[PDB]
């Protein structure tokens, strides 16, 4: 009844914080979490792991899963790679920690693709999302995307590399992928600030995170197309080790709770925005 | 074995000609629509003489099943569901155990081995039918004609039912299961058992005839008919978002194959091309 | 938009909002664990009295001030330079509270109830809060 859970920081779903110094721990709604510390990175036993408080949407849903299926869990943040990629045929991140079994399950901004699926068993997706483009204030058939390196002043747009979106683009748009590798970005908010003055024209990434951006945006900059026009409809789901027994239980519990409608309230309290409409 | 229900946004069913073949009907792009011969009763069984007349059938679900069949290289047989209803466990008359009907029952009996339809995933089905990953995303909404814009699932006029406002859903359907689970909504469920319809066509016409006031159903279906039929509008947000996922029998090996197939179809957007072929 | 605005549903640094520390609404926000984040904002801007926060809002130092209804609509009807918003989401009562042991509990209860059926506080409202 205990599992290994690991994630990294993706703002609206993952929030890391230092524990309250005046209390030692912190307020409720948060769970203890720690650095990814291996045998070499154990950093001694005087401070075996720096306690941190991790709270968020995924934290709440995993809390409900634990309280339903009656299982415990230990949480540690991930350092080696963001989430996972077949780097030289070797996976990293949560994908590496699960496939090579330093981890039991995974939760977070885990986009489900085909490759991850044959690599890692997934659950039913608890939320829907996919590809979207956001620009300061038109479709994957537009010359702005079809051949942005042929006419006009070169159109300056990009994304973050080593991601599922990058995998799909490289697998469908290798010429445009070669164009985009010129425009890679350190972080989502980094490119956001870049386009706030106009370093890059538009950003291509998850629809959900851009919804969270624009919903709280003070400038109210909207995505390339109303309603996002989400391409390659996918979601976020629980990642299980290959043919793990937990699959049936977690799927049944997750779908039952999704039908109960409280997930609507959790998304209302977590990812809602101000000027989204 | 292919089983389904005639659903205009996803399943088009027409009578074959006297010669027993499908019409050479081509798309606006000039390519013919890929149509098969699905057998089954000529009209609904109570009103029908129970003649299992084969009829031409084609559409979105048909297109995707053809694609995935070409991917897995297997033949098939197409035949719609006998009762015309989705189905659920029910302590039927003179019985004790809650028993499925519809295509779930037809599969558990073995009449069909896998379902191809815009079926909704619910936990109740999850215990008995293996759902793969969703192939489409959709939601639940309300439809009216053409002034008291209905307040989604938050209007008291729904919460305290009135004889001036008549509304219902389809029996033995996913929305029935949903309204049955939320006991707080039970009163509207009590309204349901008054006027529940049996198929989309009659309910749509009755709303167009104002026999009904508002109909709760899939987002995709309502937006499709609105973009094609007009004169009627959906209202309120998608109070319950979910997926249409291709379901199939428990523990049969093909689940992983079809799952990765629909994943790679989402990778190249082939399903998006299907939608553009079917939703303009 | 009352209480259900993501401006307040999601705590925002650009927007300032607070109350009086060591007050009932402090306990309200403390028990509402899901609202603890806004309680985190409370820790930065909590005032000590009403008048200085009122001046700050009139000086626009404070964007919004949450507090009890009666006093607030009284101030709104008197000064008219500030506007109230949000419904009385927390129904409550102003009552004479005192020690459990003393016998005046029931006596004072019945006396104030007799005044209520007599509309004595209605006359008091006409005297102090109404006609403004
Ligand atoms: C897809 O369905 C398949 C059949 O139900 C099955 O994967 C299949 O597994 C066989 C067995 O390895 C593969 O056959 C290859 O390997 C054998 C043994 O080495 C050879 O004798 C064959 O000639 C062939 O080279 C199939 O190729 C494989 N099918 C696929 C599509 O990869 C799984 O149920 C599903 N697997 C996948 C990957 O979708
Ligand atoms: C055709 O189908 C058979 C059986 O389903 C399979 O063994 C064979 O590999 C398929 N051929 C192709 C080209 O897919």
Swiss-Prot record, chain A:
Tissue expression remark: Detected in cerebellum.
Notes concerning its domains: A hydrophobic region that gives rise to the prediction of a transmembrane span does not cross the membrane, but is part of a discontinuously helical region that dips into the membrane and is probably part of the pore and of the selectivity filter.
Shown chain mapped onto the complete sequence: 401 to 800 of 1237
Glycosylation sites: 38, 162
Localization terms from the record: Cell membrane; Postsynaptic cell membrane
Family: Belongs to the glutamate-gated ion channel (TC 1.A.10.1) family. NR2C/GRIN2C subfamily.
Extracellular side: 138-277
Quaternary structure, from the entry: Heterotetramer. Forms heterotetrameric channels composed of two GluN1/zeta subunits (GRIN1), and two identical GluN2/epsilon subunits (GRIN2A, GRIN2B, GRIN2C or GRIN2D) or GluN3 subunits (GRIN3A or GRIN3B) (in vitro). In vivo, the subunit composition may depend on the expression levels of the different subunits. Interacts with PDZ domains of PATJ and DLG4. Interacts (via PDZ-binding motif) with SNX27 (via PDZ domain); the interaction is required for recycling to the plasma membrane when endocytosed and prevent degradation in lysosomes.
Job description of the protein: Component of N-methyl-D-aspartate (NMDA) receptors (NMDARs) that function as heterotetrameric, ligand-gated cation channels with high calcium permeability and voltage-dependent block by Mg(2+). Participates in synaptic plasticity for learning and memory formation by contributing to the slow phase of excitatory postsynaptic current and long-term synaptic potentiation. Channel activation requires binding of the neurotransmitter L-glutamate to the GluN2 subunit, glycine or D-serine binding to the GluN1 subunit, plus membrane depolarization to eliminate channel inhibition by Mg(2+).
Taxonomic lineage: Eukaryota, Metazoa, Chordata, Craniata, Vertebrata
Positions annotated to bind L-glutamate: 109, 111, 116, 164-165, 206
Disulfide bond sites: 26-53, 33-54, 220-275
From Swiss-Prot, chain B:
Residues involved in glycine binding: 118, 120, 125, 174, 218
Modification comment: NMDA is probably regulated by C-terminal phosphorylation of an isoform of NR1 by PKC. Its phosphorylated state is influenced by the formation of the NMDAR-PPP2CB complex and the NMDAR channel activity.
Localization per Swiss-Prot or TrEMBL: Cell membrane; Postsynaptic cell membrane; Synaptic cell membrane; Postsynaptic density membrane
Disulfide-bond pairs as recorded: 22-56, 38-57
Glycosylation sites: 42, 73, 93, 160, 257
Extracellular face of the membrane: 147-280
Tissues where this protein is expressed: Detected throughout the brain, in brain cortex, cerebellum, thalamus and olfactory bulb.
Entry superkingdom: Eukaryota
Domain notes: A hydrophobic region that gives rise to the prediction of a transmembrane span does not cross the membrane, but is part of a discontinuously helical region that dips into the membrane and is probably part of the pore and of the selectivity filter. The extracellular N-terminal domain (ATD) is a site of allosteric regulation to modulate overall receptor function.
Family: Belongs to the glutamate-gated ion channel (TC 1.A.10.1) family. NR1/GRIN1 subfamily.
Subunit structure: Heterotetramer; the NMDAR subunits are modular and harbor tiered domains that function in concert to regulate opening and closing of the cation-selective ion channel pore. Forms heterotetrameric channels composed of two GluN1/zeta subunits (GRIN1), and two identical GluN2/epsilon subunits (GRIN2A, GRIN2B, GRIN2C or GRIN2D) or GluN3 subunits (GRIN3A or GRIN3B) (in vitro). Can also form heterotetrameric channels that contain at least two GluN1 subunits and at least two different GluN2 subunits (or a combination of one GluN2 and one GluN3 subunits) (in vitro).
Protein name: Glutamate receptor ionotropic, NMDA 1
Organism, scientific name: Rattus norvegicus
Lineage: Eukaryota, Metazoa, Chordata, Craniata, Vertebrata
Gene for this chain: Grin1
Shown residues in whole-protein numbering: 399 to 794 of 938
Curated annotation (Swiss-Prot), chain C:
Residue positions binding glycine: 24, 68
Glycosylation sites: 10, 107
Tissue expression notes: Detected throughout the brain, in brain cortex, cerebellum, thalamus and olfactory bulb.
Source domain of life: Eukaryota
Extracellular topological domain residue ranges: 1-132
Subcellular location: Cell membrane; Postsynaptic cell membrane; Synaptic cell membrane; Postsynaptic density membrane
Coiled coil: none
Post-translational modification: NMDA is probably regulated by C-terminal phosphorylation of an isoform of NR1 by PKC. Its phosphorylated state is influenced by the formation of the NMDAR-PPP2CB complex and the NMDAR channel activity.
Role of this protein: Component of N-methyl-D-aspartate (NMDA) receptors (NMDARs) that function as heterotetrameric, ligand-gated cation channels with high calcium permeability and voltage-dependent block by Mg(2+). NMDARs participate in synaptic plasticity for learning and memory formation by contributing to the long-term potentiation (LTP). Channel activation requires binding of the neurotransmitter L-glutamate to the GluN2 subunit, glycine or D-serine binding to the GluN1 subunit, plus membrane depolarization to eliminate channel inhibition by Mg(2+).
Protein family (similarity comment): Belongs to the glutamate-gated ion channel (TC 1.A.10.1) family. NR1/GRIN1 subfamily.
Quaternary structure (record): Heterotetramer; the NMDAR subunits are modular and harbor tiered domains that function in concert to regulate opening and closing of the cation-selective ion channel pore. Forms heterotetrameric channels composed of two GluN1/zeta subunits (GRIN1), and two identical GluN2/epsilon subunits (GRIN2A, GRIN2B, GRIN2C or GRIN2D) or GluN3 subunits (GRIN3A or GRIN3B) (in vitro). Can also form heterotetrameric channels that contain at least two GluN1 subunits and at least two different GluN2 subunits (or a combination of one GluN2 and one GluN3 subunits) (in vitro).
Protein name stated in the entry: Glutamate receptor ionotropic, NMDA 1
Shown residues in whole-protein numbering: 665 to 796 of 938
């Amino acid at each position: 009844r205990h599992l290994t859970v690991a994630t990294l920081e993706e703002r609206p779903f993952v929030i890391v914080e230092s524990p309250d110094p005046g209390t030692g721990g912190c307020v409720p709604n948060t769970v203890p979490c720690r650095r990814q510390s291996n045998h070499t990175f154990s950093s001694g036993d005087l401070t075996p792991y720096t306690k941190l408080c991790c709270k968020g949407f995924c934290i709440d849903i995993l809390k409900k899963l634990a309280k339903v299926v009656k299982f415990s869990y230990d949480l540690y943040l991930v350092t080696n790679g963001k989430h996972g990629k077949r780097v030289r045929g070797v996976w990293n991140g949560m994908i590496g920690e699960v496939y090579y079994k330093r981890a039991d399950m995974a939760i977070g901004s885990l986009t489900i693709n085909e490759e991850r699926s044959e690599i890692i068993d997934f659950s039913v997706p608890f939320v829907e999302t996919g590809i979207s483009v956001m620009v300061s204030r038109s479709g994957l058939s537009d010359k702005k995307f079809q051949r942005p390196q042929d006419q006009y002043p070169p159109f300056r747009f990009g994304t973050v590399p080593n991601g599922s979106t990058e995998r799909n683009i490289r697998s469908n748009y290798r010429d445009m992928h070669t164009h985009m590798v010129k425009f890679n970005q350190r972080s989502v908010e980094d490119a956001l600030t870049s386009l706030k003055m106009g370093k890059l024209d538009a950003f291509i990434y998850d629809a959900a995170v851009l919804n969270y951006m624009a919903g709280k945006d003070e400038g109210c900059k909207l995505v390339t197309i109303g309603s996002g026009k989400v391409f390659a409809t996918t979601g976020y789901g629980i990642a299980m080790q290959k043919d793990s027994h937990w699959k049936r239980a977690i799927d049944l519990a997750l779908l039952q709770l999704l039908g109960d409608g409280e997930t609507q309230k959790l998304e209302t309290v977590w990812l809602s925005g101000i000027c989204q409409n | 074995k292919i089983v389904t229900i005639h659903q205009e946004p996803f399943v088009y069913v027409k009578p074959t000609m006297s010669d027993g073949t499908c019409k050479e009907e081509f798309t606006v792009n000039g390519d013919p629509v890929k149509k098969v011969i699905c057998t089954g009763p000529n009209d609904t069984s109570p009103g029908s003489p129970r003649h299992t007349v084969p009829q031409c059938c084609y559409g979105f679900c048909i297109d995707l099943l053809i694609k995935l069949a070409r991917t897995m290289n297997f033949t098939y047989e197409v035949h719609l569901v006998a009762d015309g209803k989705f189905g659920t466990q029910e302590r039927v008359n003179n019985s004790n155990k809650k028993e499925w009907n519809g295509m779930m029952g037809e599969l558990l009996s073995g009449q069909a081995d896998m379902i191809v339809a815009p079926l909704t995933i619910n936990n109740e089905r999850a215990q008995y039918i293996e759902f793969s990953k969703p192939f489409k995303y959709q939601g639940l909404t309300i439809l009216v004609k053409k002034e008291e814009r209905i307040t989604g699932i938050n209007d008291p006029r729904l919460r305290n039912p009135s004889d001036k406002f008549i509304y219902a859903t389809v029996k033995q359907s996913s929305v029935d299961i949903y309204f049955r689970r939320q006991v707080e909504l039970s009163t509207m469920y009590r309204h349901m058992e008054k006027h529940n319809y049996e198929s989309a066509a009659e309910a749509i016409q009755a709303v167009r005839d104002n026999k009904l006031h508002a109909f709760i159903w899939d987002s995709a279906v309502l937006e499709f008919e609105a973009s094609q039929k007009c004169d009627l509008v959906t209202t309120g947000e998608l109070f319950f978002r979910s997926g249409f996922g291709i379901g199939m029998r428990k523990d049969s090996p093909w689940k992983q194959n079809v799952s990765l197939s629909i994943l790679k179809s989402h990778e190249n957007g082939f399903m998006e091309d299907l939608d553009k072929t079917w939703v303009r | 938009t009352g209480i259900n605005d993501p401006r307040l549903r999601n705590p925002s640094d650009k927007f300032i909002y607070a109350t009086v520390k060591q007050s009932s609404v402090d306990i309200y926000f403390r028990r509402q664990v899901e609202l603890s984040t806004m309680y985190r904002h409370m820790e930065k801007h909590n005032y000590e009295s009403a008048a200085e926060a009122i001046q700050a809002v009139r000086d626009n130092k404070l964007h919004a001030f949450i507090w009890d209804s009666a006093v607030l609509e009284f101030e709104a009807s008197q000064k008219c330079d500030l506007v109230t918003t949000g419904e009385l989401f927390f129904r409550s009562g102003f009552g004479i509270g005192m020690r459990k042991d003393s016998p005046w509990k029931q006596n004072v209860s019945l006396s104030i109830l007799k005044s209520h059926e007599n509309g004595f506080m209605e006359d008091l409202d006409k005297t102090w809060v109404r006609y403004q």
